[PDB]
Structure formats: structure tokens, C-alpha cells
Scaffold this active site. Structure first.
Site, mmCIF file in Angstrom:
data_model
loop_
_atom_site.group_PDB
_atom_site.id
_atom_site.type_symbol
_atom_site.label_atom_id
_atom_site.label_comp_id
_atom_site.label_asym_id
_atom_site.label_seq_id
_atom_site.Cartn_x
_atom_site.Cartn_y
_atom_site.Cartn_z
ATOM 1 N N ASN A 127 0.858 -1.179 0.000
ATOM 2 C CA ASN A 127 0.000 0.000 0.000
ATOM 3 C C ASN A 127 0.898 1.234 0.000
ATOM 4 O O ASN A 127 1.515 1.559 1.021
ATOM 5 C CB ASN A 127 -0.930 -0.014 1.216
ATOM 6 C CG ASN A 127 -1.771 1.241 1.328
ATOM 7 O OD1 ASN A 127 -1.852 2.039 0.392
ATOM 8 N ND2 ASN A 127 -2.424 1.413 2.478
ATOM 9 N N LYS A 182 -0.009 4.308 -0.192
ATOM 10 C CA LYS A 182 -0.699 5.431 0.481
ATOM 11 C C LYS A 182 -0.592 6.659 -0.418
ATOM 12 O O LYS A 182 -0.506 6.523 -1.647
ATOM 13 C CB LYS A 182 -0.167 5.625 1.894
ATOM 14 C CG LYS A 182 -0.269 4.350 2.733
ATOM 15 C CD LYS A 182 -0.079 4.653 4.214
ATOM 16 C CE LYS A 182 -0.138 3.351 5.038
ATOM 17 N NZ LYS A 182 0.068 3.617 6.495
ATOM 18 N N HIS A 213 -9.607 0.628 4.820
ATOM 19 C CA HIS A 213 -8.315 0.883 5.440
ATOM 20 C C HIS A 213 -8.508 1.801 6.644
ATOM 21 O O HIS A 213 -9.363 2.697 6.635
ATOM 22 C CB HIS A 213 -7.329 1.519 4.448
ATOM 23 C CG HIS A 213 -5.917 1.543 4.955
ATOM 24 N ND1 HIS A 213 -5.443 2.530 5.791
ATOM 25 C CD2 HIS A 213 -4.894 0.669 4.784
ATOM 26 C CE1 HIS A 213 -4.181 2.278 6.092
ATOM 27 N NE2 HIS A 213 -3.825 1.154 5.491
ATOM 28 N N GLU A 261 -7.026 4.282 7.720
ATOM 29 C CA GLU A 261 -6.940 5.721 7.493
ATOM 30 C C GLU A 261 -8.244 6.255 6.925
ATOM 31 O O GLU A 261 -8.576 7.426 7.139
ATOM 32 C CB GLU A 261 -5.753 6.047 6.581
ATOM 33 C CG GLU A 261 -4.433 5.945 7.338
ATOM 34 C CD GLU A 261 -3.263 5.470 6.474
ATOM 35 O OE1 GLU A 261 -3.341 5.602 5.222
ATOM 36 O OE2 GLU A 261 -2.265 4.972 7.064
ATOM 37 N N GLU A 310 -5.090 -4.565 10.799
ATOM 38 C CA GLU A 310 -4.245 -3.434 11.134
ATOM 39 C C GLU A 310 -4.243 -3.208 12.635
ATOM 40 O O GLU A 310 -5.308 -2.925 13.205
ATOM 41 C CB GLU A 310 -4.746 -2.182 10.438
ATOM 42 C CG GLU A 310 -4.643 -2.211 8.944
ATOM 43 C CD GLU A 310 -5.212 -0.942 8.363
ATOM 44 O OE1 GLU A 310 -6.426 -0.896 8.051
ATOM 45 O OE2 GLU A 310 -4.444 0.039 8.291
ATOM 46 N N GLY A 357 1.753 5.188 16.026
ATOM 47 C CA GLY A 357 2.063 6.437 16.692
ATOM 48 C C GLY A 357 1.871 6.419 18.189
ATOM 49 O O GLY A 357 1.663 7.475 18.788
ATOM 50 N N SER A 377 3.427 -2.778 11.061
ATOM 51 C CA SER A 377 4.749 -2.513 10.510
ATOM 52 C C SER A 377 5.590 -3.787 10.447
ATOM 53 O O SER A 377 5.659 -4.566 11.405
ATOM 54 C CB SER A 377 5.443 -1.433 11.340
ATOM 55 O OG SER A 377 6.824 -1.377 11.042
#
Lengths: 246, 246
Positions: free
Chosen positions: A9, A11, A94, A96, A163, A169, A209
Site C-alpha cells: 500500500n 498510500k 483501510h 486511514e 491493522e 504512533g 509494521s
């Protein structure tokens, strides 16, 4: 035996130069197509040129699609238009898009159903936030998956991407054991809801990740079938994930 | 104010239809000194459209995000658009304000970022059927004020007034109604931005513009062009694009 699946992906990234480099990189990697299904998901504007330029053994997918036939939806990607140009995959849901654009469970399900009917393979993305991880990890992915099950009969062309949004973060690095726990729960849900033969064929790929070094450590875990790679998919590292078995 | 004609293709297209729509425009004689012509194809065709349509015609995205390249799966990047020679974008189209709940402030933020990265922005405004009762100017001024709150330089902004009740419904505003809304928009710009900026600002009409009603608008001095929807996919667009220069 579920076929190893690696999606990349990209992005909201890219230049003409960086996409030429990425694509030429994929064209010269030694792919054993028999043991890996490889797909890249470029930024929307690159979809057609990416399909034209990358070799047939690599799939191309959209990062998002609308849930309706061609029409008056300015700014959206059409599932019909995508497959007419040879783009045969798409992401739906997704994290996001669920967070920034508040795509509902039901909207993600409707996009999935429509994309499937139009002939696409759908990588349907799910996953819980850190607040939801406190006590509701199972309940969240189960609810996300149930919305898709309400609209979709045939799961042969779905792959589920988990995910770990809670680890984005937040300083927390999601470990392979933590991924395995959720993937097991997803396969349990699928067994319970769709029957054992669907669950045993259903690819559940890790979307947190990963790099080519610990890719193998994740694949040592019993229910992880591949990866939806984020940032590494723009880098040479993507090739060591795609080619991990050799 | 140079006359401006945009063609919004919305979420339509196939390889075959897009090739012939563009070929139709390529073999249409244009007065480029007289009309600024731009087409806004579906996202996947942005690069092939810029490759295939003659340099005299601009290409623009139908939407853009408000941030630099990064982790916004599914979005169009203003930096990526400019790198590939796409020099225009729409922001705030009514279909995005209504279906996707884009706020005045989000549209203003996208507009400002796109401008900073080099794009010309066709910022879209307009009132609904219900708002038309007594609130037309309250609505468009509020939408414009949000843009002015974020944007200092309007040199590369084009305003598109599309009454929502005229979008895809076939009920074109009469020019007399369009003129007075545009006159109010120019009155607003004079007060907010100064007479000099107001006098250079293109305010274009959108909403069921077709080859049969285009001419009637040309007699009204605050209507500076068209944002054409469904007709832009049709051969009659060749009229609308050239009709100012006849």
C-alpha cells in the site's frame, strides 16, 4: 493451504520518478508466482500507468473504491472503471479511511460487495484502536467483519488485513505474538460464522509494521498468511518481503 | 476575466470512452486566448488524460487532500498532481460536501494547500433546494468566507457556483437568477478582497449546462464561464467550449 499474499500500500505518496523506480524494481525481482500473490496499491492517479508498466505477475489495486455504478460522485474511484483498465484488486476499509473519513462498517461492506460483483478481489481492512484494545479487541474486529458478512455471500476473493491501529504512533511496537492472537480470533470468527472450509481458505494478512528481516518471524505464527505492507512497500525492502520464501 | 470552461467527468469513464472523448477535444478548434478550457477526469485517468489531451487544454483532479504526501490511503496528493503536470483541481464539489460531509473549513484547507503547491483551484459553492427558499446568499457567503479565512491570494482561484438543485436534475438556473447570485458573489469579493481582486475573479456557473442552454448565459456580465457536468462527456461539449469565441 492458503497462498502467501503480499500487498504493498503506497498510500498518498509518489512522483513520476519514484513510481518508475518502484515499478522497474518489481519488474526485475525474481518472483515465484506459484507461492506468492503480489499486489501493489498505488496512489489513484498512477493506477492505469502502473498496470501498463508492471509485469502481469504482479497485481494492481486501488486504495479505495465507491460502492455504486458509474455516476455523479465527484472525486471517487469506480469499481467498473478500475477493472475495465485491468486493475483487479482494491482495498476497502483501510484504517486511514475509517478514521480520517469516518467510513462506516456498513459503507465498507457495501463497497466490498459491489467491488466483488464487478470482478475485483477485495482486501478488506479491519482493526481496533488503542482505546478499543483495553477490553474490546475481539468485539471490534467481529463487528467490522459481521458488517461485511451481512452483505457478502462469497468470500473466495476476499482477503482480510488486520491493522493494529492501537500500535500506530503510540510508541507501542506490535509483536508477532500479539498479531497471532488477533489472527487466531479472526479465523475463529470465520469458522463460527462462515464454516470451517471458508475459514481455512481465508487469507488473514498482517497490516502492521513489518520489514524483510522480521517478516519470517511473523510467518512462524500459526494464523498469519501474509502482509499488507505500508511504508516499506515504497522501498527496496518490499522485495525481501515479497520474496521471503526464497 | 478570461472566460473559463471546465468539464467535470465525475465518476465515469472506460478506456475506450475516455480515448474518444479526448480525441474529440483534440480535433476541436479552440481560441485559447479567448477561453481557458479544463477537463477533470476520474482519478485513475489523470495521467493518461494529461498525456493524450492537447497542451491547450488543462487537466485537473476532481478532489485533493490538504496535506503533504503521507499516510492518507485513497486520497489524491496536490504535490503528486503537480509533479505529473496536472495543474488544476476542484475543491468542495457539492457531491463531496453532501455525500462525504466535507466542511467549509476542510474545503478551505484543501484549497489553500493546493494553491501553495501550485494548483489552480476551482472552489465550488452553492445552495440546496431548501436553502433556496430564503437563504441562498447566507449559504454562498458563508462558504466563501471560510475560503477567505485561509487563503490570502485569489489569483489562481476560480469560483464555481452550482446550485445543488440544478446538479444532474435538469433544472438549470435561469441566467437571470445566476447573474444575481454572481453579482452578490462579486459584491462579497469587493468588500472582502478589494475591488481589484473582485474584478479579476472568475465566477463560473454550473448546473445542467448543456449545448442547448449555453448561449443564453453569455449576455450576463458576472457569469465568467461554466462548470459542465454530464454534457462534458458528450460531443456537445465541443460547442460549450467554443461558444464564447463564435
Amino acid at each position: 493451504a492458503r497462498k502467501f499474499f503480499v500487498g504493498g500500500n503506497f498510500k498518498m505518496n509518489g512522483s513520476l520518478e519514484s513510481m518508475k523506480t518502484i515499478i522497474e524494481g518489481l519488474n526485475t525481482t525474481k518472483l515465484n508466482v506459484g507461492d506468492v500473490e503480489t499486489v501493489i496499491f498505488p496512489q489513484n492517479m498512477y493506477l492505469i500507468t502502473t498496470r501498463q508498466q508492471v509485469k502481469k505477475d504482479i497485481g494492481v489495486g486501488a486504495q479505495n473504491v465507491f460502492d455504486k455504478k458509474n455516476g455523479a460522485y465527484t472525486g471517487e474511484n469506480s469499481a467498473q472503471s478500475l477493472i475495465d483498465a485491468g486493475i483487479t484488486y482494491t482495498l476497502t476499509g483501510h484504517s486511514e479511511r475509517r478514521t480520517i473519513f469516518k467510513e462506516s462498517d456498513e459503507f465498507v461492506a457495501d463497497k466490498t460487495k459491489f467491488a466483488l460483483e464487478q470482478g475485483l478481489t477485495v482486501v478488506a481492512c479491519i482493526g481496533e484502536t488503542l482505546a478499543e484494545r483495553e477490553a474490546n479487541t475481539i468485539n471490534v474486529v467481529v463487528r467490522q467483519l459481521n458488517a461485511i458478512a451481512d452483505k457478502v455471500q462469497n468470500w473466495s476473493k476476499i482477503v482480510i488485513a488486520y491493522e493494529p491501529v492501537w500500535a500506530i504512533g503510540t510508541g507501542k511496537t506490535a509483536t508477532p505474538e500479539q498479531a497471532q492472537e488477533v489472527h487466531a480470533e479472526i479465523r475463529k470468527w470465520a469458522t463460527n460464522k462462515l464454516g470451517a472450509s471458508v475459514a481455512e481458505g481465508l487469507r488473514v494478512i498482517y497490516g502492521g509494521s513489518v520489514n524483510g528481516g522480521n517478516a519470517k518471524e511473523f510467518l512462524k505464527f500459526h494464523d498469519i498468511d501474509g502482509f499488507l505492507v505500508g511504508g516499506a512497500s515504497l522501498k527496496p525492502e518490499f522485495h525481501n518481503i515479497v520474496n521471503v520464501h526464497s
